[PDB]
Design an enzyme around this catalytic site. Structure first.
Site, PDB file in Angstrom:
ATOM      1  N   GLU A  35     -10.620  -2.771   3.592  1.00 24.47           N
ATOM      2  CA  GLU A  35      -9.737  -2.889   2.443  1.00 24.47           C
ATOM      3  C   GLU A  35     -10.445  -2.647   1.107  1.00 24.47           C
ATOM      4  OE1 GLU A  35      -6.548  -2.971   2.219  1.00 24.47           O
ATOM      5  OE2 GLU A  35      -5.856  -3.733   4.154  1.00 24.47           O
ATOM      6  N   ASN A  46      -0.085   1.200  -6.514  1.00 21.78           N
ATOM      7  CA  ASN A  46       0.753   1.925  -5.569  1.00 21.78           C
ATOM      8  C   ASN A  46       1.898   2.498  -6.379  1.00 21.78           C
ATOM      9  OD1 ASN A  46      -0.619   1.023  -3.093  1.00 21.78           O
ATOM     10  ND2 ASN A  46       0.172  -0.997  -3.677  1.00 21.78           N
ATOM     11  N   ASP A  49       5.801   2.289  -5.194  1.00 22.99           N
ATOM     12  CA  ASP A  49       6.705   1.159  -5.364  1.00 22.99           C
ATOM     13  C   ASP A  49       6.372   0.239  -6.532  1.00 22.99           C
ATOM     14  OD1 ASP A  49       4.463  -0.132  -4.114  1.00 22.99           O
ATOM     15  OD2 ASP A  49       5.841  -1.665  -3.383  1.00 22.99           O
ATOM     16  N   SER A  51       3.565  -1.508  -7.273  1.00 21.80           N
ATOM     17  CA  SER A  51       2.891  -2.754  -6.946  1.00 21.80           C
ATOM     18  C   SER A  51       1.391  -2.468  -6.975  1.00 21.80           C
ATOM     19  CB  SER A  51       3.325  -3.267  -5.566  1.00 21.80           C
ATOM     20  OG  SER A  51       2.864  -2.418  -4.535  1.00 21.80           O
ATOM     21  N   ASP A  53      -2.573  -3.712  -5.330  1.00 19.37           N
ATOM     22  CA  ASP A  53      -3.375  -4.453  -4.352  1.00 19.37           C
ATOM     23  C   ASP A  53      -4.573  -5.001  -5.128  1.00 19.37           C
ATOM     24  OD1 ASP A  53      -1.676  -3.511  -2.336  1.00 19.37           O
ATOM     25  OD2 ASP A  53      -2.957  -1.759  -2.011  1.00 19.37           O
ATOM     26  N   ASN A  60      -1.228  -7.564  -1.955  1.00 21.07           N
ATOM     27  CA  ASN A  60      -0.175  -6.947  -2.771  1.00 21.07           C
ATOM     28  C   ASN A  60       0.637  -7.836  -3.715  1.00 21.07           C
ATOM     29  OD1 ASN A  60       2.888  -5.562  -2.770  1.00 21.07           O
ATOM     30  ND2 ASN A  60       1.208  -4.128  -3.058  1.00 21.07           N
TER      31      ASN A  60
END
Length: 130
Positions: A35, A46, A49, A51, A53, A60
Site C-alpha cells: 500500500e 482518487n 470518486d 476520495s 487514501d 480511504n
C-alpha cells in the site's frame, strides 16, 4: 516516517496487530508494504470518486476518516485523516482494526487481495523477532 521492515513488524505487534481478527502479522506487513512501502506520509488522490487514501495502510476518506473534502463521505474510524499521516502509527492501527471488524476483513484492501492473498508472506516477518 518510512519504517524499516522489522522495526515495523515489532511496532505492529506491540500495538496488538498479530492475529487481530485472525489476521497474522505477516499479512499486515504485506499490506503496509504494497500500500505505501511502509510510508506513514503516503497519500493518493482518487480522481475517479474524489476520495483520498492516507498513510501507511492507505485508508480511504470516503468511509474511514474525515478530510472534509470528500463528497458524501463518512468517518467510521472517527479520526481526522490527518491522524493517519503521523509517524506514530497507533491511530492508523486503531483505524486498520476498525476496517477489519467489518465482514470483508483484510479483504477490504484491493492490494492485499492482489499481492498478499494465497501467497507465501513469511518473508515479511522473518528475522524480526515477532
Amino acid at each position: 516516517k518510512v519504517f524499516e521492515r522489522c522495526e515495523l513488524a515489532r511496532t505492529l505487534k506491540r500495538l496488538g496487530m498479530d492475529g487481530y481478527r485472525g489476521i497474522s502479522l505477516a499479512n499486515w506487513m504485506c499490506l503496509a508494504k504494497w500500500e505505501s512501502g511502509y510510508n506513514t506520509r503516503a497519500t493518493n488522490y482518487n480522481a475517479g470518486d474524489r476520495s483520498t487514501d492516507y498513510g501507511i495502510f492507505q485508508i480511504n476518506s470516503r468511509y474511514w476518516c474525515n478530510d472534509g473534502k470528500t463528497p458524501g463521505a463518512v468517518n467510521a474510524c472517527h479520526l481526522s485523516c490527518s491522524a493517519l499521516l503521523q509517524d506514530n502509527i497507533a491511530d492508523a492501527v486503531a483505524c486498520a482494526k476498525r476496517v477489519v471488524r467489518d465482514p470483508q476483513g483484510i479483504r477490504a484492501w484491493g492490494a492485499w487481495r492482489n499481492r498478499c492473498q494465497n501467497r507465501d508472506v513469511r518473508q515479511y516477518v522473518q528475522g524480526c523477532g515477532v
